Design a protein around this ligand. Sequence first.
Ligand SMILES: Nc1nc2c(ncn2[C@@H]2O[C@H](COP(=O)(O)O)[C@@H](O)[C@H]2OP(=O)(O)OC[C@H]2O[C@@H](n3cnc4c(N)ncnc43)[C@H](O)[C@@H]2O)c(=O)[nH]1
Ligand SMILES: [Zn+2]
Length: 354
Amino acid sequence: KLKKVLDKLRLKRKDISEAAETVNKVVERLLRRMQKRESEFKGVEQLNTGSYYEHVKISAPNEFDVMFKLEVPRIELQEYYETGAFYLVKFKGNPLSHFLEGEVLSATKMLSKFRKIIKEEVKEIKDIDVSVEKEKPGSPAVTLLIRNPEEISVDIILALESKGSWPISTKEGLPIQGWLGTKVRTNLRREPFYLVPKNAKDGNSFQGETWRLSFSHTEKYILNNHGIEKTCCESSGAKCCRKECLKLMKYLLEQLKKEFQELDAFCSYHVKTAIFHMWTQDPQDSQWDPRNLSSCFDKLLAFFLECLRTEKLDHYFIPKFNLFSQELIDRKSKEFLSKKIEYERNNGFPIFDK
DNA sequence: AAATTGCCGAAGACG
DNA sequence: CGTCTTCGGCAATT
Ligand SMILES: Nc1nc2c(ncn2[C@@H]2O[C@H](COP(=O)(O)O)[C@@H](O)[C@H]2OP(=O)(O)OC[C@H]2O[C@@H](n3cnc4c(N)ncnc43)[C@H](O)[C@@H]2O)c(=O)[nH]1
Ligand SMILES: [Zn+2]
């Protein structure tokens, strides 16, 4: 049954080819515009991120994430309260001085200019049906809607790149020592970290100056390098069901969200985060054998339910940041999701039949 | 020093 | 299952 759902979720090559060709054209154009000329974002470089580029996109290739990363030397971080994930940014005749709010580099100001430039360039595209989606408060993304004629959304994510050591809130995150190992962890943490203009929500409003930590790069590496054995899912190695298990979990949540508005606060990142913990908990490739797909999915569900019940889902990189805190998601919303998942679980997943 | 190209892994296609 | 294919990521090289 699960194998047949996976067949259904699997992307078609023809769909991939048609989508990618258009998406790549638009992105390439936006990138060229940023880099030329007297622009504040002149040095941005492209990094493709998220589900599609992690090969865990399901159903249709209609969502693409891409970061435009900007190297900003000598920045100093001040943690926004005790959130671990959100920060104010300061510097130790720059183009970025336009975005300064005091000595603080404002996320809103920088994103708004970034967004303004994108809209200008999108207006000049004549051969492709593309529009800029209406702004979402808090969101770090400038979202494009493309009609290929099929609907495709492209999230362009502005990001600051810092080459320094990672903020201490991440010191006990990335607990992959018994799984991917110490050399991998050390090497990953020697890579840069990123800040995206996602504002912290403080009560009824957003703190417009705040930035948010990003490890979209690391997550991408982990998805592509996910086994304890170096040959996991390689041509001279054994196939595992780690990614398949993630697709099924993503699908379950997506179907549930499609018919229950009370689940708007839940997202695929919660699912991704839960399975990262699961991969830490069950490190052996043998406990992710394709023959044991059914029990792997069940283990994930039980773990997820327990996170729901205890209102605790630690960010994989920032362990003191609880994705399932009462502050972020209401108790009733979690209890609601708990009931739905339990139902689908005990009933052989009727919602998988659309 | 921006744009081209080579290589090959991941995974879809179909036997 | 194997073999072929395309897309993505990389960085040498001009
Ligand atoms: N990547 C990511 N996404 C996060 C997130 N916290 C919540 N979410 C949400 O999950 C979904 C992820 O999409 P995916 O393509 O990976 O399957 C989205 O619904 C995302 O919602 P969002 O409102 O927060 O973000 C919108 C837009 O911004 C990107 N984004 C959010 N946050 C980041 C970070 N930290 N780095 C890079 N990009 C980020 C989202 O991908 C989406 O494109 C989380 O921490 N990370
Ligand atoms: Zn594997």
